[PDB]
Amino acid sequence: SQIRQNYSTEVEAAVNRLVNLYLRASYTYLSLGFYFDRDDVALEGVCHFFRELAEEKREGAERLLKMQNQRGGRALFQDLQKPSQDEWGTTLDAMKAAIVLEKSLNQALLDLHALGSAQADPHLCDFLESHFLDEEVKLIKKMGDHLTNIQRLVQAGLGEYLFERLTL
Amino acid sequence: SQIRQNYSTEVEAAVNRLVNLYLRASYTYLSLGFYFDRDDVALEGVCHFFRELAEEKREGAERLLKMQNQRGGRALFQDLQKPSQDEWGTTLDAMKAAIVLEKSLNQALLDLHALGSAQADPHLCDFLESHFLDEEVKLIKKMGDHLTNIQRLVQAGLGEYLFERLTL
Amino acid sequence: SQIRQNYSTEVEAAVNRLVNLYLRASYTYLSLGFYFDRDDVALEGVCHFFRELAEEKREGAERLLKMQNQRGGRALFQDLQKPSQDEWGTTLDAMKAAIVLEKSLNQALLDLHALGSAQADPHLCDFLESHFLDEEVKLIKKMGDHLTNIQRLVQAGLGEYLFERLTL
Amino acid sequence: SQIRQNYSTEVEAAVNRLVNLYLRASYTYLSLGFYFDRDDVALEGVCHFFRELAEEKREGAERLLKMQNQRGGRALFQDLQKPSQDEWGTTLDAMKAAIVLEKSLNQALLDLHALGSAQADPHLCDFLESHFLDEEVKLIKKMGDHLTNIQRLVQAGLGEYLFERLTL
Amino acid sequence: SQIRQNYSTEVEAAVNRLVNLYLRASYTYLSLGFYFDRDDVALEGVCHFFRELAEEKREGAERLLKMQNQRGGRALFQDLQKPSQDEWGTTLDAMKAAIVLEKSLNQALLDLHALGSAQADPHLCDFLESHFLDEEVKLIKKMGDHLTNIQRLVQAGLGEYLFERLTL
Ligand SMILES: Cc1cccc(C)c1O
Ligand SMILES: Cc1cccc(C)c1O
Ligand SMILES: Cc1cccc(C)c1O
Numbered sequence: 111s112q113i114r115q116n117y118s119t120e121v122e123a124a125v126n127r128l129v130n131l132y133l134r135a136s137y138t139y140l141s142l143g144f145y146f147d148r149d150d151v152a153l154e155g156v157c158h159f160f161r162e163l164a165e166e167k168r169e170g171a172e173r174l175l176k177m178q179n180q181r182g183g184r185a186l187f188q189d190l191q192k193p194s195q196d197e198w199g200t201t202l203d204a205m206k207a208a209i210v211l212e213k214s215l216n217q218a219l220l221d222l223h224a225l226g227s228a229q230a231d232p233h234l235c236d237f238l239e240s241h242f243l244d245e246e247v248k249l250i251k252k253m254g255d256h257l258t259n260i261q262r263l264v265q266a267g268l269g270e271y272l273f274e275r276l277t278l
Numbered sequence: 279s280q281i282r283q284n285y286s287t288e289v290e291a292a293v294n295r296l297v298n299l300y301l302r303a304s305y306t307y308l309s310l311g312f313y314f315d316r317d318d319v320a321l322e323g324v325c326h327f328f329r330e331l332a333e334e335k336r337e338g339a340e341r342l343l344k345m346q347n348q349r350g351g352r353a354l355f356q357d358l359q360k361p362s363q364d365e366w367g368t369t370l371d372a373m374k375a376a377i378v379l380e381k382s383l384n385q386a387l388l389d390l391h392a393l394g395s396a397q398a399d400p401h402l403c404d405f406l407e408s409h410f411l412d413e414e415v416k417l418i419k420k421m422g423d424h425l426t427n428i429q430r431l432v433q434a435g436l437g438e439y440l441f442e443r444l445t446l
Numbered sequence: 447s448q449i450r451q452n453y454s455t456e457v458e459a460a461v462n463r464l465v466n467l468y469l470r471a472s473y474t475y476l477s478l479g480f481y482f483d484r485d486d487v488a489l490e491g492v493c494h495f496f497r498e499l500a501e502e503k504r505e506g507a508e509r510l511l512k513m514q515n516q517r518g519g520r521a522l523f524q525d526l527q528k529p530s531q532d533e534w535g536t537t538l539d540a541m542k543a544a545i546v547l548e549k550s551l552n553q554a555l556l557d558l559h560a561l562g563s564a565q566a567d568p569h570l571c572d573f574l575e576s577h578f579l580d581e582e583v584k585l586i587k588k589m590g591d592h593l594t595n596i597q598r599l600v601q602a603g604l605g606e607y608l609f610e611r612l613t614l
Numbered sequence: 615s616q617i618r619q620n621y622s623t624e625v626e627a628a629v630n631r632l633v634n635l636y637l638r639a640s641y642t643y644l645s646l647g648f649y650f651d652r653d654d655v656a657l658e659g660v661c662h663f664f665r666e667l668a669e670e671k672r673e674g675a676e677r678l679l680k681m682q683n684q685r686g687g688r689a690l691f692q693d694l695q696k697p698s699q700d701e702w703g704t705t706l707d708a709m710k711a712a713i714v715l716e717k718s719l720n721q722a723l724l725d726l727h728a729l730g731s732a733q734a735d736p737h738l739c740d741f742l743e744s745h746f747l748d749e750e751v752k753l754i755k756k757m758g759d760h761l762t763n764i765q766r767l768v769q770a771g772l773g774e775y776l777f778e779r780l781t782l
Numbered sequence: 783s784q785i786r787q788n789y790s791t792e793v794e795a796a797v798n799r800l801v802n803l804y805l806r807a808s809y810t811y812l813s814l815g816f817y818f819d820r821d822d823v824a825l826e827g828v829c830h831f832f833r834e835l836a837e838e839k840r841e842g843a844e845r846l847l848k849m850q851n852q853r854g855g856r857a858l859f860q861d862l863q864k865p866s867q868d869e870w871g872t873t874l875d876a877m878k879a880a881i882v883l884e885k886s887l888n889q890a891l892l893d894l895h896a897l898g899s900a901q902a903d904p905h906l907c908d909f910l911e912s913h914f915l916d917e918e919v920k921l922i923k924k925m926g927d928h929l930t931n932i933q934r935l936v937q938a939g940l941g942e943y944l945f946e947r948l949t950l
Pocket of ligand 3: 805808809812836837840862
């Protein structure tokens with residue numbers, strides 16, 4: 111690329127993999143959202159929480175793709191694997207699975223940052239710090255707070271209703 | 279009728295029967311509403327939910343009557359049978375009875391649509407699709423969601439109070 | 447499902463397949479969009495045209511998923527296959543590939559409509575007519591108009607620039 | 615300096631050199647701008663593009679000088695070498711020379727960042743990341759996009775006119 | 783002091799001690815607040831309640847310091863002892879500890895008032911009456927009300943959630 115400067119092939123590849131991970135996370139949250147919209151589950155606040163996350167994760171992938179082009183890297187897409195479950199159980203099960211998912215994304219961001227540092231690519235490092243690392247820490251804190259409240263509430267049915275009504 | 283065109287006697291009769299079914303559904307919801315306004319039941323959100331449905335069902339009947347005249351059919355009214363119960367039990371019992379009622383109305387709409395298709399009466403078919411079929415599907419989904427939440431809540435007294443306060 | 451009425455397993459399955467097709471179309475347009483954002487392609491109007499389509503196709507998938515739940519069907523997700531190309535050539539090549547893609551989606555909608563009619567499922571039929579069939583016809587007309595203008599313009603470089611500047 | 619803390623003489627010197635490079639880049643863009651304002655060149659959008667860059671590069675130098683003082687370093691100025699050309703040829707030639715210039719500035723920023731990291735000077739590192747590195751990547755992407763469009767357009771005279779009229 | 787009038791050394795010393803007690807109370811509430819912000823505690827209304835009290839107690843200390851200077855006394859600061867606990871248990875435990883703390887501050891205010899009366903220092907007496915005594919009585923009443931509601935609620939987990947959601 112005429113513009114490409116200080117952008118390693120290793121980082122270019124890792125950014126494409128991270129795009130895949132973000133899109134897959136978006137897909138998982140799409141599945142979570144619509145599961146809570148089932149007439150036999152029917153927790154609308156929970157559905158909204160996960161649909162909003164689907165949107166955030168898609169947006170993250172697009173920001174990565176924009177950056178890939180800004181640096182003169184080449185976007186390469188792979189299949190998006192279907193989410194790991196078809197039914198997501200209780201709000202508690204779902205929030206546990208969400209925190210597992212976010213910790214995996216966070217670890218991928220930290221791995222990519224370490225790669226960037228090793229490659230002396232400060233634009234990449236700052237990009238991740240400025241748009242992704244703090245967002246992940248904030249989101250994981252919120253999920254952890256939600257998990258704690260869900261657990262203190264679970265008369266499990268009543269607790270699930272009240273969390274959806276009064277927190278979400 | 280000077281205006282009557284492509285409007286079969288079979289559809290004309292079925293529309294009059296459907297008017298009766300809608301008015302009877304309105305009457306049933308009127309009874310449901312005032313039952314929840316009893317001082318010994320006293321669930322105002324539930325009363326409001328059913329009174330609003332009484333109004334929607336009356337409006338549906340009037341839309342059918344307007345259409346009957348637009349097509350040159352002749353409105354014929356029959357007795358409105360009193361609702362099937364004098365007392366409606368718990369919110370859960372009432373929501374189950376509501377969903378039974380709406381599924382019967384939906385089935386009548388689907389039967390009338392099939393009749394219309396068989397009679398090659400596309401204005402009738404579109405009329406039902408445009409004003410009734412989606413409204414019924416949306417309403418049945420909402421009732422199903424409500425039933426699920428009511429069931430998860432039932433300390434049955436506390437659950438009935440909380441559903442009325444926080445959902446309705 | 448407590449709410450499920452007149453909703454065949456065949457339609458339920460076909461709706462899940464159509465969701466997959468819409469999401470895959472969204473993914474393809476995401477790839478098309480970012481290809482035109484490459485510094486060595488650099489046709490921003492073209493990038494915007496396809497990114498807007500990625501959004502429309504995602505929205506279509508979500509509308510289908512909402513409907514699946516409204517009817518008491520169960521959303522089931524499959525892998526999203528990566529787009530058919532990694533690089534999309536000229537605007538002309540890309541618009542040809544877009545029209546191929548939209549005609550395939552349109553044909554799937556028409557197949558699902560025929561299935562719905564065969565199953566006497568008028569809510570499904572109306573749903574597709576009301577939210578998808580006319581949108582596809584309008585979009586295919588616009589793409590065809592664009593293809594014609596692109597072809598009349600191709601001094602191919604100058605023509606590609608002018609179409610992007612003055613049409614898109 | 616009473617305030618100086620963790621600020622190496624090596625970084626202090628490199629910041630003064632970078633100030634010189636930014637001012638020289640401003641001067642080069644001043645020359646580019648006025649060349650495109652010649653009555654026998656007369657591409658006003660091109661003139662405006664480079665005059666705006668002259669301003670951005672001056673501003674960058676002033677931000678560096680402000681930082682030098684904030685850290686207790688001492689600004690030292692050297693001669694500003696005249697730009698490398700007196701006449702800049704076509705818009706294409708000029709945009710190529712601009713991208714060469716920006717890549718040299720970017721490399722100097724990356725060298726200074728590496729120096730900062732080696733000297734464990736995180737304020738310097740963040741300063742460059744926050745005000746300079748992303749601005750350079752964005753600008754180089756825009757120039758690369760412009761170069762691609764210019765190249766696709768070059769009936770070279772007509773292409774140069776159209777790029778100036780419709781892009782700049 | 784040129785301005786000092788009717789201001790005993792005993793009151794001057796007692797005001798400095800009360801400043802210390804108010805700052806220590808602020809510190810204790812800072813600790814309480816951040817404990818309820820832990821991801822494994824996660825009661826945000828409780829966190830906010832105590833952080834607001836940290837602010838009120840700091841403000842009280844500053845008002846005392848302002849008064850010390852207005853009277854020509856000399857502010858003298860001592861170490862601020864760390865709060866008595868590192869973890870504060872349940873909301874109930876925390877509210878009990880808060881009421882213990884406020885009763886100790888109230889008693890110190892009453893002791894200082896008695897000292898003022900004994901020293902015939904009416905400005906001091908009025909100062910405490912006008913800015914501190916009624917505020918303490920109001921705050922202790924509110925805490926007592928909160929304690930009663932917390933106790934009536936403790937399904938202890940559900941009760942703690944509901945108090946935080948609906949009272950705080
Ligand atoms: C709301 C309502 C209920 C029963 C019968 C009639 C005519 C009506 O308007
Ligand atoms: C989940 C998903 C996959 C591909 C493209 C988009 C826009 C999307 O939301
Ligand atoms: C809010 C607070 C707590 C402890 C110590 C100080 C000085 C303070 O302002």
